[PDB]
Amino acid sequence: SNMVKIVTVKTQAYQDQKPGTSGLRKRVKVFQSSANYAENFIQSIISTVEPAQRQEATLVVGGDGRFYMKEAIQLIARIAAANGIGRLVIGQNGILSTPAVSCIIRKIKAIGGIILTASHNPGGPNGDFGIKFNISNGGPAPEAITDKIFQISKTIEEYAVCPDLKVDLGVLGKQQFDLENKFKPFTVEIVDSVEAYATMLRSIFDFSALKELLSGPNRLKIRIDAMHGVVGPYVKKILCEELGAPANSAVNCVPLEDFGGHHPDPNLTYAADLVETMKSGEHDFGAAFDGDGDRNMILGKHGFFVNPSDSVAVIAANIFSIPYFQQTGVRGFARSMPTSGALDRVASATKIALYETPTGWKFFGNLMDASKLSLCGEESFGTGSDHIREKDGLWAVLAWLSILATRKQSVEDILKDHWQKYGRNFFTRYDYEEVEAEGANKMMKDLEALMFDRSFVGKQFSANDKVYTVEKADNFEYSDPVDGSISRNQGLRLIFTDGSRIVFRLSGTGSAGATIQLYIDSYEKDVAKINQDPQVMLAPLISIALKVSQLQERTGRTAPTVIT
Ligand SMILES: [Co+2]
């Protein structure tokens, strides 16, 4: 073996291989039962690399450990070898977290990477599978490249593969493959899954201070729940082995091919195990990650919930607790439009630009590539920095520990102080899942028409205590300052004069069933308001949102499916 033949396989294209912004996800059975589905797509990706540049190109390959990953990596290798790709760098056992791929691409100046993950979607023999393509800055492929891959996938007529090539994913080092009658070899470098990423965090944070925090007398007690996904080994090797947290800090930190039969999705119910652990009051800090590691939930003592919109605000407000930002400075803050305005209060107090983007990474990456963005957040458990071009779940955790280490206060006390300083943006997201598509569209269209009337600005809404006055109402548009793209229809906003907002979106992917996402952001500054139950303080704006949108009338829903 190890000298292998190159073969050409005649194939028949499928028409549904759209790469999207977060990858091609299909049921695993689809990859398995649809002949050459994966081979075709892997070939389409490689055809976007100019033939003349392939020998000097490196692709980074790894994934989140879910069922079918290793088979796909073998398939990526067999096809990369046959197409003349010079080198793959593959994490051991195929394991690379998504922030780790971003780290490695940028570090070694790779042309890009292929990440085998479906993020928070279930995995296993009956679960989902995903294939994600990243380009040379370590981030998601932009629309121009994903368009080309899609166009190729629909009309591909043959692909190249080395059918007898097999990579040993389990042993570190360089494996070389000689291709029959090809002059130059194919090289695979298997790297430790954690090292390059850990070395990055070691530069970014003060691991000494963290070691003192987590070790010893009066240590901060933490529980870090990787939800049986990719971040497990990162937790064990970084938080436990290097930084000295007791071994019990690492919860569900063995990657499982089915994520233990659960959704590796961090929130209070999918991560019920972590929350209940935290409820005992014995530990100071808890966190959960998603399957591929770019999302994070932060919990405090007794299970105190730091909502993601508040989290980026606390980091922003204490950002120089982190050595990285001490060196680079803070170039800007950003959030997606539906994320709460907690970050804005800080960006205004610290006089830093606040960028409000449509949902989606591309907008942050552009701003980061322009050196105009240091810290970004999304209401969906996302926090990141410009250290890479993906969001970074464990990075956010190590950021919190830096602030806890510097502040020497509890998580809950830090949040109360923040609310005392900046006011609190009470925030919740209502999901209405699988609603009939026709009604939702009429709901959005009618609401947009209502808001578009000249008299709507200035309309007053009574609450049962306060009056909310409409300051601005539109359908969100964004002119991207880097690539010049204009993103239109990004969400109906009801902006009130007191700093509160209601935002409606109808969810994109509404093909299995539409989703209405209603976000409520109620700002309060008075001390007699800042420590009450959020769902109580949010009730008036919820009432106003449902009345003005007539959500119940258009859909028959008396309640959202999920509340976060
Ligand atoms: Co993810």
Curated annotation (Swiss-Prot):
Consequence recorded when altering residue 123 to R: In CDG1T; there is 7% enzyme residual phosphoglucomutase activity
GO cellular component: cytoplasm; cytosol; extracellular exosome; extracellular region; ficolin-1-rich granule lumen; tertiary granule lumen
Chain positions with N6-acetyllysine modification: 18, 351
Keywords: Acetylation, Carbohydrate metabolism, Congenital disorder of glycosylation, Cytoplasm, Disease variant, Glucose metabolism, Glycogen storage disease, Isomerase, Magnesium, Metal-binding, Phosphoprotein
Phenotypic consequence of residue 40 to Y: In CDG1T; strongly reduces solubility; increases aggregation
Residue numbers bearing the N6-succinyllysine modification: 421
Phosphotyrosine carried by residues: 355
Subunit-structure text: Monomer.
Illness association: Congenital disorder of glycosylation 1T: A form of congenital disorder of glycosylation, a multisystem disorder caused by a defect in glycoprotein biosynthesis and characterized by under-glycosylated serum glycoproteins. Congenital disorders of glycosylation result in a wide variety of clinical features, such as defects in the nervous system development, psychomotor retardation, dysmorphic features, hypotonia, coagulation disorders, and immunodeficiency.
Protein name: Phosphoglucomutase-1
